[PDB]
């Protein structure tokens, strides 16, 4: 049993700043004979497979930028990123290979950027869905920051909480924003009883709700 732990679990840093993350093993990973620490770092960006960054604790894989530096020895190791770039958003794992292989729990690196208001789009149910008796109403909330946001659905002016399913994207690797999708699912029967459908977004970038709506007679 070699236990691996990492710190912090997550953090956020502005582009251009320094990032420091830590890795500990429950026993030394140092082969004193060969003077090698059996400790590697892997980078996993959203929806991608892990990628080898560092091995033997401090050797950069070919093609890895020099802003990434691994250090430490024995039981304590550090991955440092000087001048973080937007594209560096990812989970970083450390892994011992002194005794079989064990990964740490990972450190989630996110990027701080200026606040940005969400761009809100609403979409009525498709006729192809309606034909089968369902009615889903969709609102996209794109390219906002910070991640904290609330969406309220209203039907004929009254809030509807049941039947809503929300999903957030991982941070955008280009512009460091977030996006969210909110889908309200009704039956066709219920959908046809009302006229006005509205999604209201609450975000720190606006004192008033950010609202999109439609009526069933357009």
């Amino acid at each position: 049993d070699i236990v691996m732990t990492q710190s912090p679990s997550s953090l956020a840093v502005s582009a251009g700043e320094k990032v420091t993350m830590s890795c500990k093993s429950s026993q030394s990973l140092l082969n004193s004979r060969t003077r090698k620490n059996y400790l590697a770092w892997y980078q996993q960006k959203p929806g991608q497979s892990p990628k080898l960054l560092i091995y033997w604790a401090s050797t950069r894989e070919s093609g890895v930028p020099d802003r990434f530096t691994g250090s430490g020895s024995g039981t304590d190791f550090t991955l440092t990123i000087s001048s973080v770039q937007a594209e560096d958003l990812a989970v970083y794992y450390c892994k011992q290979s002194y005794n079989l292989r064990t990964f740490g729990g990972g450190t989630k690196l996110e990027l701080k950027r200026a606040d940005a208001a969400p761009t809100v789009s609403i979409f009525p149910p498709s006729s192809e869905q309606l034909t089968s008796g369902g009615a889903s109403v969709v609102c996209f909330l794109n390219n906002f920051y910070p991640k904290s946001i609330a969406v309220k659905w209203k039907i004929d002016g009254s809030e509807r909480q049941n039947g809503v399913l929300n999903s957030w994207t991982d941070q955008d690797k280009k512009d460091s924003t977030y996006s969210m999708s909110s889908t309200l699912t009704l039956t066709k029967d219920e959908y046809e009883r009302h006229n006005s459908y509205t999604c209201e977004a609450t975000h720190k970038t606006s004192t008033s709700p950010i609202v999109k709506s439609f009526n069933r007679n357009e």
């Binding site: 091995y55 079989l100 979409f123 869905q129 969709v138 996209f140």
Partner: protein, 220 residues
């Protein structure tokens, strides 16, 4: 070029069995140890097993989490790596990666998993396989469109736009499970001068049901 391709993932009932494969090329297979690593949705990587190279007699090792339950093997004539999985449980639901491991007999030896496949997804569940319904999202300078991929099981589905030719300005939202069915959506933002004058189509695949859909987004 080093290539690793996993296959064989899918839906399997609790207590059932499944065998994953990993096709390799671009290197001398028998010179290398090979590992399997898994990752449940939203969780950390977990190393599972390796099999050593020819020099070491192709011996195997396992994490305690799977030893006695999973069997790693290789076929050196067709350069495949396999993982036989038995008595599967919900905790075994995850994406499984094969990764090229070490060759300590090499002058260029270093200790790491240097190449990884795209991964193959496994879901351990008694729920039935259900194909997605795919619905267009069209509005009632720039214009945002989308596709709603609703009511499928199991994960995953893939979504592209215009066969991958539209990639920037695309957001595909992580699937959400509700009542044993997944739903996800994808938005795409393009110049208004290009839609609907140019065609915008979402391409959706659901491997578990062999579903392939093309849904053209039309004004309406």
């Amino acid at each position: 070029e080093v290539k690793l391709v996993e296959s064989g993932g899918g839906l399997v009932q609790s207590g059932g069995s499944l065998r994953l494969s990993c096709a390799t090329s671009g290197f001398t297979f028998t010179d290398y140890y090979m590992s399997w690593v898994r990752q449940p949705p939203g969780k950390a990587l977990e190393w599972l097993a390796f099999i050593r190279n020819k020099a070491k007699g192709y011996t195997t090792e396992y994490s305690s989490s799977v030893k006695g339950r999973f069997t790693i093997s290789r076929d050196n004539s067709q350069s495949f790596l396999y993982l036989q999985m038995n008595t599967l449980r919900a905790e075994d639901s995850a994406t499984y990666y094969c990764a090229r491991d070490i060759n300590p007999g090499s002058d260029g030896y270093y200790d790491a998993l240097d190449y990884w496949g795209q991964g193959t997804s496994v879901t351990v569940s008694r729920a039935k396989t259900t194909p997605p319904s795919v619905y267009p999202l069209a509005p009632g300078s720039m214009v945002t469109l989308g596709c709603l991929v609703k009511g499928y099981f199991p994960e995953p589905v893939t979504v592209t736009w215009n066969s991958g030719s539209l990639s920037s300005g695309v957001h595909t939202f992580p699937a959400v499970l509700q009542s044993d069915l997944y739903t996800l959506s994808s938005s795409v933002t393009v110049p208004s001068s290009t839609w609907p004058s140019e065609t915008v189509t979402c391409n959706v695949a659901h491997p578990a049901s062999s579903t392939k859909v093309d849904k053209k987004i039309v004004p309406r």
